[PDB]
Design a protein around this nucleic acid. Sequence first.
DNA 1: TTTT
DNA 2: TTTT
Lengths: 420, 420
Amino acid sequence: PAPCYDPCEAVLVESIPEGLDFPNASTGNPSTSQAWLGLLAGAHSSLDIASFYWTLTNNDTHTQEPSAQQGEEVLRQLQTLAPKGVNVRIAVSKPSGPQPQADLQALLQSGAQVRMVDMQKLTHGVLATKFWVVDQTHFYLGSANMDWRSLTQVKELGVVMYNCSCLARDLTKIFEAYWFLGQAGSSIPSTWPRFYDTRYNQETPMEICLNGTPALAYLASAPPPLCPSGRTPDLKALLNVVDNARSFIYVAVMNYLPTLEFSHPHRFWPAIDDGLRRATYERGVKVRLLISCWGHSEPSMRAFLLSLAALRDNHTHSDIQVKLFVVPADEAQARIPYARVNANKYMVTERATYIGTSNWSGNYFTETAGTSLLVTQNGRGGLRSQLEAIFLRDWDSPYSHDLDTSADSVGNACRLLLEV
Amino acid sequence: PAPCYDPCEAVLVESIPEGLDFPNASTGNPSTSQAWLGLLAGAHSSLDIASFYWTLTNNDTHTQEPSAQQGEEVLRQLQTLAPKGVNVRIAVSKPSGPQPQADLQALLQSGAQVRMVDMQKLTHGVLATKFWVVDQTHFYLGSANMDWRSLTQVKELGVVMYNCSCLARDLTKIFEAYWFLGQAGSSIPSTWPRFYDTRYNQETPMEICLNGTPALAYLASAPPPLCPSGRTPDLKALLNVVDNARSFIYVAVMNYLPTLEFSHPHRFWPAIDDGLRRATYERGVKVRLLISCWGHSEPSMRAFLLSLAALRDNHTHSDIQVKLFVVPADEAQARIPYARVNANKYMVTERATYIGTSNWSGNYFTETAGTSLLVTQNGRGGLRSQLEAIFLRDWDSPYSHDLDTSADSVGNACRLLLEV
DNA sequence: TTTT
DNA sequence: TTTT
Ligand SMILES: *[C@@H]1O[C@H](CO)[C@@H](O[C@@H]2O[C@H](CO)[C@@H](O[C@@H]3O[C@H](CO[C@H]4O[C@H](CO)[C@@H](O)[C@H](O)[C@@H]4O)[C@@H](O)[C@H](O[C@H]4O[C@H](CO)[C@@H](O)[C@H](O)[C@@H]4O)[C@@H]3O)[C@H](O)[C@H]2NC(C)=O)[C@H](O)[C@H]1NC(C)=O
Ligand SMILES: *[C@@H]1O[C@H](CO)[C@@H](O[C@@H]2O[C@H](CO)[C@@H](O[C@@H]3O[C@H](CO[C@H]4O[C@H](CO)[C@@H](O)[C@H](O)[C@@H]4O)[C@@H](O)[C@H](O[C@H]4O[C@H](CO)[C@@H](O)[C@H](O)[C@@H]4O)[C@@H]3O)[C@H](O)[C@H]2NC(C)=O)[C@H](O)[C@H]1NC(C)=O
Ligand SMILES: *[C@@H]1O[C@H](CO)[C@@H](O[C@@H]2O[C@H](CO)[C@@H](O[C@@H]3O[C@H](CO)[C@@H](O)[C@H](O)[C@@H]3O)[C@H](O)[C@H]2NC(C)=O)[C@H](O)[C@H]1NC(C)=O
Ligand SMILES: *[C@@H]1O[C@H](CO)[C@@H](O[C@@H]2O[C@H](CO)[C@@H](O[C@@H]3O[C@H](CO)[C@@H](O)[C@H](O)[C@@H]3O)[C@H](O)[C@H]2NC(C)=O)[C@H](O)[C@H]1NC(C)=O
Ligand SMILES: *[C@@H]1O[C@H](CO)[C@@H](O[C@@H]2O[C@H](CO)[C@@H](O)[C@H](O)[C@H]2NC(C)=O)[C@H](O)[C@H]1NC(C)=O
Ligand SMILES: *[C@@H]1O[C@H](CO)[C@@H](O[C@@H]2O[C@H](CO)[C@@H](O)[C@H](O)[C@H]2NC(C)=O)[C@H](O)[C@H]1NC(C)=O
Ligand SMILES: *[C@@H]1O[C@H](CO)[C@@H](O[C@@H]2O[C@H](CO)[C@@H](O)[C@H](O)[C@H]2NC(C)=O)[C@H](O)[C@H]1NC(C)=O
Ligand SMILES: *[C@@H]1O[C@H](CO)[C@@H](O[C@@H]2O[C@H](CO)[C@@H](O)[C@H](O)[C@H]2NC(C)=O)[C@H](O)[C@H]1NC(C)=O
């Protein structure tokens, strides 16, 4: 199409939980809370949020952690900007049960518009996407839910893109699809209107000027029912990034399960698994797997991970490595539910970066809604280099262990590690 | 079509190498040499042989083993039956180099017809199929090459079907395809003539009366270029047998490699691997893998086998097991080249039996020619029960070891076992 | 935070 | 015996 001549800039924002201190410095990454506060402070025209759930104050969790203050602060800002004239629009997946939405109620009193999307009725999944669209110029995409633990107790990774109206407007197209599909008694059209169609897919990515240097970027979305003709499926983009790699593949995802799970009877989904095996066997790609282990991690994952870790022989010139990133939790932090975990989901190769909002399982790519950003930048350095440095800092941390590590030495409770 | 009302009978013939003594008795299986001698003695009209290579006397190997006597005896019989009026027709793959064909020369002097098939020119593989067709009534199909070591030094498994003109004639259709395609300067027709077409495929298998009880049988052939419209591909039949299983899958194959190997650069072929994983994960199928390890076994296989053996967790209700069957070899037998190995290739489920002539790798199903027999018999007992008993005798033998076994304790030289 |  |  036509190039976006916008001073597009990108920042990698990650929230580091308390008690997690990477000795290596130079991280120099703004926290998700700081980036969100900066976005809200500069918001004056519009704001579109797509969230899995909202749990910000201490009341929504019935806890008494001072650590929630930052999250509460965000809520305050969200309440202040509605009366100023900003069109706040929030899409939140419908809770299966009658869960009280205190934060949503407060926002509705403020003047925001909340349209709850009942994904189970239409596609049989949930709306687990996390992205922001501010003034149709800036946007945030990452692994952060509107929770206060995702700002202080969960580890994270997201990108805030500034001064990129074209890409932000492309992300809005998706938010508007969610907005229309979840008002009341609606269903997926056979053909989406020309409003929701896009011209920036994997075949023809958009030419942005990222930090001065030219780059090719595009957004991919799940599930296939909600994707217009132009939009590239998230699984297709992920597999293309995996296939195009020639030197290394670094992946940091929270859950990796080659199955369409929570879908009894058990169903096998070897889409991503085969791609990694092909990459590590047909080509001399060094593949590094960084999974996160917490109390709610399905144990059946471990076996599959071992199946991947066995492909490491000189004869096969294969270099698959798997490591588990476990965030330690002391007695006080163990009381917080769904608190201490690494929820980053991204993949960096030697020539491309993938930042997504959904874990790697069949549900997130067939039923559950998700969005991802793919950026290829020619030349050394850039966004890819920063993401690679982040991954290498995580990989060499004392918080990442091999699959044979005894579960006692790990700080938290790991279901993927065998005792002694 | 129309049922074959022939007193079809089936015998499982296996050659047990010297030094291999299964303490458990009741094997009661005629040796391949005895079955071949019986077939040749009763041959009076025709005889069609498809063989990878011919090496029967001691001269063809430049050795002095008395163990070759049986093989030599077979050669003598093969020379005697040509003058009697039997139309001997032999298809043998063209040796890459100018290897002397002493046995083929002797047979040509006897009066036989030898048409050497240059598979490399047409399909870029070899003619590694092993089957016999006697009087168009009896036939033999199995893992035995026209070698004297395949009768005394290599372990084997084949089926001799007696009084089954319809099935024998169906096997001839394949032999005639090989005969026509390898005379001189020929190529694969775009559409094979109606002579080579068959009506007994996986969709409509042939109804035979095996040992009195009704059964459904059909033959599958590789590679796809040589297969007529009716003929079912060998890979398709194998995958259908794997998919249809509900209780267990027992496989005894000489080489298992999920790759189109000897095809640099390395290519990934996860066709059978995914089928086994789906069977063991989606369904509660107990899968048992019995691979054979010898000096010429590619080491890169080991890693892949380990990748399969990792799928064994209660949570995954998966029961993949892998074992290596190694035939011991003393000092005297170590001198014989390509001698001490288990070359059986078959798979038995709770409702079907597969007996094939090719190992499990990409070449044998994409390029290399191969043939297999599939028999489903309703009710307990029968051919399936005997094959299952054979597999269970092999599995519990002292000659089958787990993949973690030290390579020193094994009698032979194993490239798939790590020292200490 | 998608898993009890 | 398909693998050097
Ligand atoms: C493309 O262009 C964008 C736009 O500028 C760049 O984004 C900037 O990136 C730099 C480097 O990542 C950011 O600078 C860093 O900010 C971190 C967080 O900012 C806050 O830091 C403290 C936290 O208490 C606050 O007091 C402060 O006011 C900020 O709000 C800092 O922590 C970093 O300092 C740390 O790291 C450096 C080494 O990097 C050390 O020397 C320091 O001592 C300290 O340890 C650093 O200042 C900058 O904030 C980003 N801009 C914006 C607007 O956020 C992209 O980086 C650029 N991309 C590429 C590839 O060049
Ligand atoms: C469908 O119908 C066919 C046609 O009959 C059956 O094929 C017969 O199968 C039986 C059982 O497998 C065969 O009988 C066995 O033969 C073995 C080999 O035969 C030779 O044995 C010695 C070897 O030196 C020779 O002297 C002899 O003359 C034969 O040439 C024997 O070794 C077996 O005996 C051993 O096992 C039994 C237990 O089974 C012990 O009791 C014995 O002591 C001994 O250890 C046995 O005699 C028979 O030969 C097959 N027929 C033909 C023509 O070959 C199929 O079995 C049948 N299928 C089903 C499912 O019923
Ligand atoms: C996205 O674009 C906007 C507008 O182009 C950028 O805002 C600009 O940011 C620069 C750097 O902070 C500002 O320069 C500063 O100006 C003040 C005087 O106002 C001066 O005292 C400082 O020393 C500095 O030179 C600039 O004024 C400001 N422009 C506007 C209109 O606000 C913004 O920085 C861009 N996004 C990112 C992430 O950089
Ligand atoms: C395939 O079919 C042929 C022909 O139907 C079978 O040959 C038959 O085998 C039986 C059993 O050995 C023979 O019976 C025997 O007859 C002799 C007299 O000739 C008798 O002394 C024995 O006690 C026994 O009853 C039968 O004669 C023979 N028929 C022919 C025409 O040869 C053959 O056995 C079948 N294949 C298999 C594997 O059984
Ligand atoms: C969250 O905290 C408690 C519930 O645990 C509640 O606090 C109330 O706060 C308001 C405003 O200050 C008071 O008028 C009420 O008396 C408080 N109730 C108590 C102390 O039981 C309330 O649900 C939440 N508080 C805030 C400030 O949002
Ligand atoms: C070939 O594989 C062997 C494993 O037997 C590698 O040997 C050692 O591998 C460990 C980790 O796998 C390293 O820490 C050692 O430094 C290796 N030792 C030596 C002498 O190399 C070997 O590195 C592999 N060859 C490669 C990767 O080129
Ligand atoms: C195989 O064995 C040897 C080669 O190692 C050869 O034996 C010859 O046998 C014929 C027939 O008995 C004799 O006339 C020759 O004199 C033998 N040659 C020798 C002993 O050097 C021959 O190549 C093969 N023998 C047979 C019987 O096939
Ligand atoms: C569940 O898995 C465990 C492995 O931790 C099995 O426990 C033992 O498994 C070994 C072989 O894997 C057997 O030899 C032992 O007899 C098992 N012990 C017990 C007490 O069962 C266990 O069998 C598995 N459960 C199944 C297969 O139902």
